[PDB]
Design a protein around this motif. Structure first.
Motif, PDB file in Angstrom:
ATOM      1  N   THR A  96      -9.349 -14.634   4.612  1.00  0.00           N
ATOM      2  CA  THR A  96      -8.056 -14.378   3.959  1.00  0.00           C
ATOM      3  C   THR A  96      -7.229 -15.667   4.087  1.00  0.00           C
ATOM      4  O   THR A  96      -7.562 -16.556   4.892  1.00  0.00           O
ATOM      5  N   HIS A  97      -6.181 -15.818   3.284  1.00  0.00           N
ATOM      6  CA  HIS A  97      -5.523 -17.120   3.281  1.00  0.00           C
ATOM      7  C   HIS A  97      -4.808 -17.348   4.622  1.00  0.00           C
ATOM      8  O   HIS A  97      -4.721 -18.484   5.094  1.00  0.00           O
ATOM      9  N   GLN A  98      -4.346 -16.260   5.239  1.00  0.00           N
ATOM     10  CA  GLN A  98      -3.790 -16.315   6.596  1.00  0.00           C
ATOM     11  C   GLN A  98      -3.751 -14.891   7.188  1.00  0.00           C
ATOM     12  O   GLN A  98      -4.335 -13.963   6.610  1.00  0.00           O
ATOM     13  N   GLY A  99      -3.091 -14.717   8.330  1.00  0.00           N
ATOM     14  CA  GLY A  99      -3.222 -13.455   9.093  1.00  0.00           C
ATOM     15  C   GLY A  99      -2.654 -12.229   8.402  1.00  0.00           C
ATOM     16  O   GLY A  99      -3.277 -11.168   8.398  1.00  0.00           O
ATOM     17  N   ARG A 100      -1.484 -12.356   7.779  1.00  0.00           N
ATOM     18  CA  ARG A 100      -0.905 -11.157   7.132  1.00  0.00           C
ATOM     19  C   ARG A 100      -1.690 -10.703   5.899  1.00  0.00           C
ATOM     20  O   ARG A 100      -1.584  -9.541   5.493  1.00  0.00           O
ATOM     21  N   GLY A 101      -2.480 -11.603   5.313  1.00  0.00           N
ATOM     22  CA  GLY A 101      -3.409 -11.213   4.241  1.00  0.00           C
ATOM     23  C   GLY A 101      -4.481 -10.281   4.822  1.00  0.00           C
ATOM     24  O   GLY A 101      -4.852  -9.257   4.228  1.00  0.00           O
ATOM     25  N   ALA A 102      -4.944 -10.607   6.021  1.00  0.00           N
ATOM     26  CA  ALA A 102      -5.905  -9.743   6.721  1.00  0.00           C
ATOM     27  C   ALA A 102      -5.254  -8.431   7.168  1.00  0.00           C
ATOM     28  O   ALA A 102      -5.894  -7.378   7.143  1.00  0.00           O
TER      29      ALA A 102
END
Ligand SMILES: CC1=C(O)/C(=C\N=C(/Cc2ccc(O)c(F)c2)C(=O)O)C(COP(=O)(O)O)=CN1
Ligand SMILES: CC1=C(O)/C(=C\N=C(/Cc2ccc(O)c(F)c2)C(=O)O)C(COP(=O)(O)O)=CN1
Ligand SMILES: CC1=C(O)/C(=C\N=C(/Cc2ccc(O)c(F)c2)C(=O)O)C(COP(=O)(O)O)=CN1
Ligand SMILES: CC1=C(O)/C(=C\N=C(/Cc2ccc(O)c(F)c2)C(=O)O)C(COP(=O)(O)O)=CN1
Ligand SMILES: [K+]
Ligand SMILES: [K+]
Ligand SMILES: [K+]
Ligand SMILES: [K+]
Lengths: 456, 456, 456, 456
Positions: A96-102
């Protein structure tokens, strides 16, 4: 050593500079007294966050030159996959592009509206994504993690009695999952013990409940385990990390922290069915299962970074540099959250600004004053960040009302830490001067990022 | 401030490591007890030299992506040319791959066999190229420069009485040129005052004698003028540098020092005829007048670095970091050259190893012992480097018998300096253990680079 | 395929543009009608040389981020050393900043004044360094290499009868060495056969004479052997390259050609004593035996590039792209050296400008006209480059009077080749307009690089 | 010029290779006959997409070295912001990691459940986000856009009579907005005329309806306007782009197309209230208003690349290279969509595979066969991509059943186009060998990305 020399040397630099106090006053007012709204060029030492602000190695910059930028099936994705499978031991990975995408993916995949998610203390994005998917967040962290001044080991541990109470009262089937974060950011970067990880696995497994780790600072956590948990003194950081994740069903990760990168994250899971569903959803928000909203070169830099982070001398120095800042602050009687955590020193604004009530946002105001007096940017981690209760509309009122001096990995030196400490200590001598704030603009969620204030 | 924090932060890193003492003992013997023959991976902290070991900035690395690699007329050459014209004020520039390439050209261009070249202390490559072209080197540095422990300002200054004596005794027409180095490397990195540069210009111009500067550490030199020469306290580093070269007819430059690069040099001159002759010769040894043995990207990085080097806070920190190491050593009673110079601390091997004679090569042996005991590489700057008299075959035998702890620009921290100081201070406690050396292999010139030794 | 598609795709670009004809006219005049003196920005397609103008790969750029910039014992040097030992089969390597740096070393190490050096056609820097060290150059290339219009294979072959004659008339002890170049640049990029290298090895060995290869375009050479020499059709480029050098005592190399880099070279030798003497001398002109005037990153880029160059599809395309240009020219009746060589098409200016005598410098003037009419830069390779007879002062008068359209590796496309061909063919339609030139300024050596001319 | 030479040359390369047919057959089966599921390493020439696969310039790579990685207020964000404000003329910009991130934001911001969104042909992610937020998609593209073989100019134009009918029958208040894409991807990369943008602007503004452009290939679109729309022949590409957006209320942009980058996107708007709401939402999914899920370096590369795209010779060659491929295919009687669009040649799989029905997925199968026979990857753009009707569950079944040969910017040459064309033409000669496919795995949305098939 209490304080080791850097286990690296400098390959390249970027300049820093400081605008005069008169100008910082103006800039702080233009930013509505919210440090998030200050511009990078106006900051002398930027301790807002350790997220995405890390210095990469020569080996990672070599990886940056080897991006296979294919829309699907990139060689860099396969390097990332293999690395995470080897180091974390999870069966499957979706970038994912960063953690909140995950977090967006996990929350949609694993929550039925009405269910509970139980965590070792809330996090801002994490809680928002849980609630927007219909979950109620239940804090099962041990009480001590909310006790700022208490110097105890493994403050991040889950209280198994709170977990058992949730199960008894609400029923296992009504629990979407347990979110176990390592370290625990809002508790001060406090580690979780292997003993606790094993105990949580055992209880949840017995009741058929899933456990997903927030792996964002798992290497800092592994370090505390090696340093302080009996039986682990002679284990490698890599061995610790791998055992940690054997007690989990999957994880969210922001690589922007312990993977030593400027962008990147991922979602891991063992379950085949969840993996299939994850892939069906990643293309909606992020990109293909083999890029997840990242350039090929960044999957590469992340793969390389995660492996570098496993080096003992690197992570020992990382953590001890932070500890050094805290020790300097303590030596002068400046109130901080104890013990010092993996990634930051947390000033206790409840003590620093005793003359203010939490309703006048002492942490938010302290962060503004720190900038005005020193050119150092720091982050509100208190009542503002905690947001509003989604049933009553009142502030959530965390016990911890703190200002985070957050250290990017491999960017600053002990001399920079001395400058920060000196500035905070001088401000502490006239802490009574710090004025309360009030909202003049409040976003409907994650309000701390862009809220604007004025003095009371 | 005594010791400023770094006026930059870290953009990228490269790891360091240390092999155990028992392995270093073996490696040192395999290297024939000569630190030049050690492998980079076997060294923990590499203070052999500040030449070409500098960390570049993000801006320089951006210029590294913009090399115009044309064989002739590269835009990067024109950027370098106008930068040097602007900052140094010389009419013409000829790039060379590094300093000794420029020395080769100057010496061939400006020396008739039998003539004298007079300089403020010899340098190794510089003297070899002078002598190879049939000149006799004459040392006109003030006597104090050879007195390690004497703490006086501007030890690099030419003694005008020595210059006058040479003119009187040999005749002005028999002097090829004056070589005026800023700073003076072998004196301890000692600066030359603006007043001295002016007095040298006046005397040489009255007799028609040319003066060529060795510009290699001119920016460190300009720092000392700003800091210590009355009348210069409010001038910028750039305007000090420009004034300095207004007293020269040209210069040699290794950009690998104060231009903040890993490779690069040049030759400057005001005379059109010499410029023409220099261009006829550059193609024999280096490359075109518009690349001179450099990739276009390196002319770019060198142009950018020279300009970055003029920032006051950068060079103030650079010099004071070296001073910090020197201050710690002096405070513990370790004998050093004083005052501390721009680029290095020089241990006084004569005093450090009073039980050895200079004939037993105490500087060479002290460097070997430092590596064995600490993993720090340092450089012999004494009887070995000084070479043999090319008329008599006797060792030159300099008064300064020193080991150089040489600091790359923007690479190390104060913590690294502390590690280095601690190690030297511990070795000093048992200095009587340092054994004398003898040659087992001696090169015919510049013998220090690859000579091999054994203990007597 | 007659003409394969590129066996790579573009990772990054730099723009090209063309200034109008009337501006090019002014620029050519300001350049004294010497294409060497044009600025890069004023050139549309720059075919001056394939030297240092190559496009590197992503893997090489990865290597560029991993420079171990140590003054001595760099890990990059050891990677280079092991690559050259493996691929070329020489015992020892000494790095140099580029090819003529290695020629300087070789010529000083291996020539006693009064001796002969025999080669398969002269080269400019090579011959100058031989002569400067007191040698007389003797051309032992087969007669056919001087016959521009003759289309035969392996034109670079040494005529064994000429070598035998030299041995008979001057004595083996009076020959410093044989210099065997692969390919032969000034013959038109013409290869040498394995059969010939074998035969030269056998004759020289019997007489105790040393053979040093000029390895600069040895991969292009290996390609012709594979394509054309019986018994080699199923050998790898690497196998062929390794066998080639098994017939040599050492080599000079400019890495700026077939090693696919922008800077770099080296000297190799099997002899232990010569290696020791080379190391004593390298420090005078270039740098340490472990950097030789190159940044660590460049030894790395050169190590990677040499190994990449051995890929069959790469060198196949490289050579056939050049052949494509030559074939388009021949199809229009434009006179060229035959067959087409590995790195360039050589226009035969003797035929192209048959209305001018060689003393009017047809190749120099043709090159000037090509730039004026098309924006394409090309190089004089005729009477100007050949220089002056160092005994009589007259021009050396090579039979080959050529203009070189030199193709950098991996930089241009077939569409660029088409544009160059269209421009030359159009100029050829009015070749009678090309005017003779005369010297206005003549350097004392290597005159072609910076000479200035005017129209007769 | 029919077909210009590249207006750039190669700065760096990456190798390509081809696995043999028998291996390709196995890889294709392993990928369930879906080209999206192939690995990059197994692809010779990768024409899956022009998204994120572009070659950057040296200037962009310089920018990649200057990322200000601050979590908030990065200088790279301000560069991007002022670039887009200058070139597009929108008041406000919110970065997003790529295009569908901007679509997620726009759709949540601007759609009330039950409203209509009308656009000039559907797009896959665009329609999904519209529908998931409760909108009904209405196609208002002129009928000719759906007629593959009909060669008319400006096929992307909205039919003003369809827009008027929508307003008449549903009411302007029930229309969330108009989506005007430039070019129209799924029509074949078909341009929209300035005349149509003005007419749409006039009609929508009269009814108070907002128009948001899909800006993704707006520069290719501007090229067609310059080339073909009378009254624009003398305008620069930048002037045309700026005028286009003056008829819009905002835009979504995937920078991975015309901004010449490998990752990046943004959302623009003029309305202050919508900017504020977009900032409240960006932090949920993407990141701060000043990074939006991108590294600072990528905001830099995107700002640089968008500006480079405006160069006339660049975009002329980009579009004419696609045209070259299309012209070659058309001349051999291969059926394609006409006219050829900005970014790709679309094979008409209905005509290519006339022996199959659309129910047998001829575009999906034709893409699989192209890979088996040629090593070239291409994309299904027909019945699979079009997905299912979200009310009835039936396939949407588009008139255009196409396979897209999509050309990344600045990556391939005309010789690569010849190789692709040759292979397609050869397959067309035995087109009746192409077999029908059926689903064996079908995702619930955006099914083409990861669906698996088997032969009927
Ligand atoms: C333990 C955990 C995090 O620490 C975290 C991020 N951390 C940030 C950035 C940030 C996040 C939320 C804030 O309220 C905040 F003000 C700053 C930080 O500085 O602490 C994320 C989310 O990972 P993303 O940032 O890659 O999406 C998930 N889990
Ligand atoms: C004042 C001056 C120098 O300091 C200098 C170099 N300095 C080096 C490298 C080195 C040189 C000579 C040695 O004996 C030595 F052991 C080390 C150094 O470490 O000090 C050169 C020559 O410049 P190049 O090195 O670019 O050719 C010219 N002038
Ligand atoms: C077979 C051989 C070469 O081709 C060669 C160089 N070649 C050049 C550059 C150049 C050289 C000499 C000229 O007259 C000339 F106009 C251009 C060229 O374009 O051909 C060197 C020397 O290698 P360096 O250039 O790395 O020092 C040695 N040997
Ligand atoms: C006119 C428009 C696009 O063309 C577009 C993307 N295009 C792609 C990538 C892709 C997208 C959707 C697919 O079904 C597909 F198979 C491939 C492509 O190849 O065509 C996006 C979305 O921008 P993101 O890709 O930056 O999120 C928005 N608008
Ligand atoms: K170096
Ligand atoms: K070059
Ligand atoms: K990409
Ligand atoms: K960042």
């Amino acid at each position: 050593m209490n304080y080791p020399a850097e286990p690296f040397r400098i390959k390249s630099v970027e300049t820093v500079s400081m605008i005069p106090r008169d100008e910082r006053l103006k800039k702080m007012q233009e930013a509505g007294y919210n440090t998030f709204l200050l511009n990078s060029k106006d900051i002398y030492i930027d301790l807002l966050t350790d997220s995405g602000t890390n210095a990469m190695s020569d080996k990672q910059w070599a990886g940056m030159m080897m991006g296979d930028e294919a829309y699907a099936g990139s060689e860099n994705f396969y390097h990332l996959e293999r690395t995470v499978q080897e180091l974390f031991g999870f069966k499957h990975i979706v970038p994912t592009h960063q953690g909140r995408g995950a977090e967006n993916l996990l929350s949609q995949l694993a929550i039925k509206p009405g269910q509970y998610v139980a965590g070792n203390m809330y996090f801002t994005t994490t809680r928002y994504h849980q609630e927007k998917n219909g979950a109620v967040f239940v804090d099962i962290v041990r009480d001590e993690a909310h006790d700022a001044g208490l110097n105890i080991a493994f403050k991040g541990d889950i209280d198994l009695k709170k977990l058992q109470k949730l199960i008894d009262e609400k029923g296992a089937e009504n629990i979407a999952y347990i979110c176990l974060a390592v370290t625990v950011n809002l508790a001060g970067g406090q580690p979780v013990s292997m003993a606790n990880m094993r105990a949580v696995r055992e209880l949840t497994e017995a009741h058929g409940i899933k456990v997903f780790y927030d792996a964002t600072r798992c290497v800092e956590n592994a370090y505390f385990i090696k340093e302080q948990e009996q039986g682990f003194e002679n284990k490698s950081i890599a061995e610790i990390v791998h055992e940690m994740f054997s007690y989990a069903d999957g994880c969210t990760m922001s690589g922007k922290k312990d993977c030593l990168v400027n962008i990147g994250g991922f979602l891991c899971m063992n379950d085949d069915e969840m993996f299939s569903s994850a892939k069906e959803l990643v293309v909606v928000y992020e990109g293909m299962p083999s890029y997840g909203g990242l350039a090929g070169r960044d999957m590469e830099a992340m793969a390389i970074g995660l492996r570098e982070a496993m080096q003992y001398e690197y992570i020992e120095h990382r953590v001890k540099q932070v500890r050094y800042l805290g020790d300097k602050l303590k030596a002068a009687g400046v109130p901080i959250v104890e013990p010092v955590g993996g990634h930051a020193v947390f000033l206790d604004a409840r003590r620093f600004c005793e003359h203010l009530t939490q309703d006048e946002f002492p942490a938010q105001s302290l962060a503004a004053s720190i900038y005005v007096e020193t050119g150092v940017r720091s982050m509100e981690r208190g009542i503002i960040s905690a947001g509003r209760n989604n049933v009553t509309g009142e502030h959530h009122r965390p016990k911890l009302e703190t200002v985070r001096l957050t250290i990017p990995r491999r960017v600053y030196t002990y001399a920079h830490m001395d400058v920060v400490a000196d500035g905070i200590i001088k401000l502490y001598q006239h802490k009574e001067d710090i004025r309360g704030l009030k909202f003049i603009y409040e976003p409907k969620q994650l309000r701390h990022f862009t809220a604007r204030f004025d003095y009371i």
